[PDB]
Amino acid sequence: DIPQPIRGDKGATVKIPRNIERDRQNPDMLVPPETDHGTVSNMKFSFSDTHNRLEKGGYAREVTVRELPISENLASVNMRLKPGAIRELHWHKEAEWAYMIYGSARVTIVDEKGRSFIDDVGEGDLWYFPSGLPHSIQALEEGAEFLLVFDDGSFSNSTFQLTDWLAHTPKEVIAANFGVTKEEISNLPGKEKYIFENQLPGSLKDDIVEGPNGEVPYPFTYRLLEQEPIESEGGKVYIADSTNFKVSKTIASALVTVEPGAMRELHWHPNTHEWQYYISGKARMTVFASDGHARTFNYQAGDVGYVPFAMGHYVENIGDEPLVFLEIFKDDHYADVSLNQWLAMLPETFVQAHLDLGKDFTDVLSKEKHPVVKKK
Amino acid sequence: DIPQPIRGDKGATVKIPRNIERDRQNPDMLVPPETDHGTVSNMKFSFSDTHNRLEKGGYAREVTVRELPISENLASVNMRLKPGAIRELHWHKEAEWAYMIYGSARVTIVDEKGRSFIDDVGEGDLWYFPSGLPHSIQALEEGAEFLLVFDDGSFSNSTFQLTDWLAHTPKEVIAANFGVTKEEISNLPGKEKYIFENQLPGSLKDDIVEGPNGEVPYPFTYRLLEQEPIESEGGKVYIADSTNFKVSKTIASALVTVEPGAMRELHWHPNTHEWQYYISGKARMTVFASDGHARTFNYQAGDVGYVPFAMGHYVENIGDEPLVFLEIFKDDHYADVSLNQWLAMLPETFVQAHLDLGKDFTDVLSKEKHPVVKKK
Amino acid sequence: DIPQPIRGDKGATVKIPRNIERDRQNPDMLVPPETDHGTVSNMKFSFSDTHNRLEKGGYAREVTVRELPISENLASVNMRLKPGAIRELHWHKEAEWAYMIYGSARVTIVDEKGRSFIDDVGEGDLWYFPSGLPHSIQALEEGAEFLLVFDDGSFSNSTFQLTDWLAHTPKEVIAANFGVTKEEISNLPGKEKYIFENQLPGSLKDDIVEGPNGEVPYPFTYRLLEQEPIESEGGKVYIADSTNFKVSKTIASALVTVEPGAMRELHWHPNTHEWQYYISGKARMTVFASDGHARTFNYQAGDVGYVPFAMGHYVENIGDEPLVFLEIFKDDHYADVSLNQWLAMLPETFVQAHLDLGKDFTDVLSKEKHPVVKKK
Amino acid sequence: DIPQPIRGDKGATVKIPRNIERDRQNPDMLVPPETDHGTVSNMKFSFSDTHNRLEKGGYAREVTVRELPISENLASVNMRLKPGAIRELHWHKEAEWAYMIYGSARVTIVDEKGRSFIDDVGEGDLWYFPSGLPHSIQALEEGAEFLLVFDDGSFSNSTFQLTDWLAHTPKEVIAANFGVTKEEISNLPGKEKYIFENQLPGSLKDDIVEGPNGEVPYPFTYRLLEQEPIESEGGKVYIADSTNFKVSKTIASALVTVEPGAMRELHWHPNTHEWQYYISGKARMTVFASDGHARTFNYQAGDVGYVPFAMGHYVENIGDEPLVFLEIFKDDHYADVSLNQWLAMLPETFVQAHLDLGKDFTDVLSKEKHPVVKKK
Amino acid sequence: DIPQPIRGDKGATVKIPRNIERDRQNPDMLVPPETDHGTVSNMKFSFSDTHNRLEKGGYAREVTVRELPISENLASVNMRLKPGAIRELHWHKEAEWAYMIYGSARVTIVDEKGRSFIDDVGEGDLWYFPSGLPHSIQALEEGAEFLLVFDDGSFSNSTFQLTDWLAHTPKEVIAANFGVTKEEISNLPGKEKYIFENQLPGSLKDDIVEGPNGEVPYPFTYRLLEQEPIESEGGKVYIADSTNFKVSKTIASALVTVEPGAMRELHWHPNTHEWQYYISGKARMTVFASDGHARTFNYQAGDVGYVPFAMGHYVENIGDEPLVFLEIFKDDHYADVSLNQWLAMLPETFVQAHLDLGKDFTDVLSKEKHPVVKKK
């Protein structure tokens, strides 16, 4: 019913007004593992705790370094479009990564050689837009809801939109630029649109714009869920980085599915920081920060998590439904070190010497890697 | 039942897994006022979203700049003690301010001239401990739960405790220091205690330690709720700063009570930033950040809020119970500018010229200040 | 006619397209003193080199740290109002200092106790508005042009205006705040005004708003040119700081007049940095930056200058008209050390030992201070 | 005659002493486009506003981050040499890029394998010296004036010269280093030379030093104006980056010629910041900074301009002579996105939906890129 | 003989070439107390490890933040003058504090009102020169060696000297400034002197310069060793801060003498950081840094030590001669909390509860403060 912060003979009942409903969401924080210790930065924020920007055509909300200070290199947007609705043609400094959670959308991109790419993106699909290349998103008939990642954390939306530019350009100059009159463009919008209602497009193949510069070298979309996952006992892992999704130079990703009674094994990342989005399910994760520092967090749908470079962690399902979350990295490749596989590949007695345990332990070690394992 | 982010013809239903329960807590964020605009830093964090440290004798949890990056100058602890239980003798770099929310406690402090102050602190009472002066807290028979503020935001607990010092001092040196043998102190704790169980003390007057250095010049405790408040229509405001609570040089405070259907009026602070703790009730606040920037937040019990220097704001009760919250300032005095009183003290026609309104508006302006006002 | 960068046998003629007209403005930079040496930061910027913001009622342009990086603590605005025209009621984080160069204006200010101050300010008059206290400016019949200083350099205008606040506040809340209906304020401006046209006010004494809180302790205006200046041979110096202009806690100022063939003597400032505005005339100044570093600059009307803390400098008139400029300091008092008076107050032979000169030099030293001296 | 800051019913005449001559240089700043909005950092500085360092043999002046704070990654020197005159053998941390505007010069460079490169550089030619590789410049018979760029903005000249090193090395050590006596080097300069007069060299082929290490892999000079430019209607663009000028790893450049009545089209850069030098002509440029922020600047000969990463801009000729300026980038390649070509490669109706315009607009869009366009 | 890093069953002999002589100087670092733990910044640097600047007349060497990064607010110079020798008239941004260790010197200072102070300073005497006020030092017949402290740590000597200024000022300007000819000052030094040989002065009373501005309000010299010290069992403490040495606003100091077999008691400072100079003797000090962090250092003559704000420490004599060292604070007052006196002024049983000890311990506690205690 009413949880209290009490572990054996430690803790006490809360005696002041309180937020019982969040307490129920964070059992491993109201009552942390004995093994937790030391000061650790917050690694947890909820999109439901952010200002939702509402437009005609949908909404957008963001978690940034101003919300989650630990994540300096990475920021995120939860964006929703209604059918036909357009996220306005635009560009950023930051590169853009996306996972399509609900629905479908058509995207356009034009690169620096004037070659265009137009494609339809479904559930489980990704796009990656390189830094500074202009693009757009239009929801199809189901509408669309997707998660966006940008490789800077100071990122507010702070974005360049097509009509915001022209609205703050002398009409004199725009005319000269295109070779028309001032009057011929009297009706340019006096203000940005950002997201706006529009009619559903037609077939993709009818929208494909052909040009003298040719096809682009590598596609900007990736069908993640149509690749053969790494399947282990308690779940699936789908990886997309610059090695298979070529243009994704600055973002490496993994979609992790964890069945009930399963966990993303103890591991860490040797290349860089890990940014997390929880799509569905409930989880806990303890972050090992070295020098006997450790802090445990709770996550569920709509939460952003974080694991600083090289810190040891696990991700454990603690509910009845499957756990589905994204592992995101600002890097050109995915990499992890498995605790199991590490010790498996060392001399038996050496490990035994370290852990004060016998052969009955080293016998269970596996030399294959199993990202997601299941209980007994 | 199920809230959606929809305002008239803007927004759309959520189509991905989500945190309905937080959504219900943040109505003015899932559906913000039309008048909200622009990128504004998060001004909202919940203690229920922090790691609770559990000890024999109670708990402590903290909101810091690592949780709420905007608050660089101020940090807070929610501390709970069981009866008899001692928060260990210690000292910090930071000055310490407190509000006793539940129960009662006995405190000790000794200053830099070797004068001691020992006092009992009840519900509604404050203490202020200057930077670097050593102190302690012991809960009496009801136990104790209080809110602590420290005038640095980078503050982890990162504190100097008496037994942690001696445990990391050569026994050789401790002995020489006091003029005893190594054996006479063989039983010094090999580890810090921090919070620990203990027997209830006796009467205060039996604990008063007398010394050759004399009484301290100004008390370190303040009975806030025994002062005559500023009473206006919709509520009460109790102010304590360096002008009435003399030793409170670096912390100015206000306890604000707002009845249902009432609000803390539109105002701002000309001296410095405002840090907020919500003791009970539910609230919304819009922060006006200049240059047409504004963001609205929701608050309830256990939440920390923030208002950057000089930004315009109001605090409105949006539930059935009274709204009770603290306004905290890193400064030697409390100061606000009331929107009402400002315009009241200007020429009638001048204000009219500004607002495009008539005498039917200027007639309502009041030259007295009413921090908390009530509706119609 | 055509200046070249040539000093004796150093330099050469310019051989690329060039800006002859600026070259003519900076003779001591195109051809620096032999004695100049080393890398020194730019200490010179012109308001004519800034974006002029044009409104109905006037203009405003600013020199900030984004223009002049050396000046981190101080920024400036050149503001112009037409007759009747209002700079909109507003407030800043930064304190505000002003010199009325042309015309006259009426100002209002209300402090944190709800006491109002309304006064008329003429040519040669100052105002100082403490941090966060709300104010306004309205030009009288001649109109008005004045120089503003704010004690932060990162200061863009980034200011809080009255109608910008209300436009980004829920109408629901504004109504409750004042106790009127939504309809009663349907006509509130949907946008800031900033500067706007208005009818000339009436007599000052008819505008004086009386209140229950009383008169303010110290006036916010100062008649600088009606004080007896420090008169020396080549000019006049008028000083206003916290010692005579009481409320001017964070800004110390001097208006310096230098006749032709005269100079502001060799001196430095022991308290803090010096910020300069050149009102009229032409000047040169060499900044001595220690360790044999020295750079000379040219200044004329509309230029901002700067002298980092304690650096040695002189200000010399190099044209036919009087030189009039402001010395501004972020401090509660004015202070200078005169090179002459320094050496005058030391033993004769001691100075002689230092400078390798005789009694024919020490005999000219004066023990009185003469800020501004004249040639032979 | 006398310009005023007046646009229709906005602005007013200047009423204080002022710099009419600079006002005449900045028409689009004294009177900005209506479409300008918001606070934008200064993007404009003039070499004529810098201290000219005069030596026997020529001069050097620099624009740095201390002059133009926005340009943190890039700094520049305007250097002039007389005939025969030597810029002393030296090296920097920063890489060095150059454009030869007037005259000609002979350069030497020796790399880290002891291979030397000696070459003659004429008008329109470039050199690039990698970081830390030692080099020199000697003007031939016409003398020489060139623009230097270094890929750090904090760059003062702060350079290592050959004789400054030896002058601050123990003579004992120098002797041991070369295997001579102290007396054999008694005449080493006791001070740096930097720039000094010297006799004209002979034929290049007579100076070519041959060594056991061999020819260098890629030349350090590039004949820019002997390459076939991108020719469009209103001008020419010559590009040199790491793809054609191999060693130019950290500097990408474009020489842009704009005829009268022409403009460098609306575009932006997706890779990095743009640094500008105006060689001849007069120009205006509006910088689109996103979020409805835009500021217009004026440029002419001797001015440095700047465009932060990805910001939208155009460069328009506003005088009777051709406009010639350099686009400089700290990157290994040149890249731009053309506004025209972007929209050209999108579906017709999609663009129409965005801009609120018809087919009479989309019909003018071109799929080829025309950097420089001409009016009607 | 040969020390090894071995404590009981921990450590091992050194097996690589090593610095046995420093090892002998740092016994408590080669073999630290068991109680040491954790990463702590270096708190120790030796003047013998710095570049000695040699001039005609003496030397100067400095320890700065570039040597000892922990000390950001404070820097020091060891300065030596020969008889008659002059440290050149000069001024700094930083305030200047001094202790005269050997010999004697005459100082001059002139303040901002043109009042001069000239005085003779002996062994055990201090001077304090406020920020930016010009001064000089001349050694008398024994010569002089003194320790200087400046309240900034980034302080190189980076100082303004009188002849460096005039050497980098146009002769034209100097002449106009004083009203003489260029020829009358043809012999001004073309270079700074800094320290230079000179004849011994005469009697002080013959050097006293009288002026129209009057005597200075408070002297700039303090006879420290002629005040009655705090005398305790193992030593003496002489304190000088703004309360007794009035002008010493930004520097608080203590000269501490510790007899053999004695120690500066366990204590900390509640106001600010402690900077240390060891004049004579040998010492060890353990710094308690909180969170179980502690590091022990060794000090002897010529060493600079440091104790960050509020950190617990003791200073123990570990040799045969008395220990003499300075405690320096950037603050307007001296303050310490004694561990003994703290616990002495608390209830007996309360302390007992904390330390797990009995009355046989609390009985030894003293309510008087004894900075320096002696062993048994």
Ligand SMILES: O=C([O-])C(=O)[O-]
């Ligand atoms: O989709 C985007 O690029 C955005 O929201 O800024």
Ligand SMILES: O=C([O-])C(=O)[O-]
């Ligand atoms: O109470 C305190 O001082 C703490 O928690 O650090």
Ligand SMILES: O=C([O-])C(=O)[O-]
């Ligand atoms: O006058 C002012 O305060 C301004 O321009 O921001």
Ligand SMILES: O=C([O-])C(=O)[O-]
């Ligand atoms: O040419 C250069 O390298 C310079 O001026 O430092």
Ligand SMILES: O=C([O-])C(=O)[O-]
């Ligand atoms: O004595 C001084 O002031 C110095 O050494 O800079």
Ligand SMILES: [Co+2]
């Ligand atoms: Co991971």
Ligand SMILES: [Co+2]
């Ligand atoms: Co407030």
Ligand SMILES: [Co+2]
């Ligand atoms: Co000055």
Ligand SMILES: [Co+2]
């Ligand atoms: Co460009």
Ligand SMILES: [Co+2]
């Ligand atoms: Co101490």
Ligand code: NA
């Ligand atoms: Na550990």
Ligand code: NA
């Ligand atoms: Na606005």
Ligand code: NA
């Ligand atoms: Na020098």
Ligand code: NA
């Ligand atoms: Na906008």
Ligand code: NA
């Ligand atoms: Na510990």
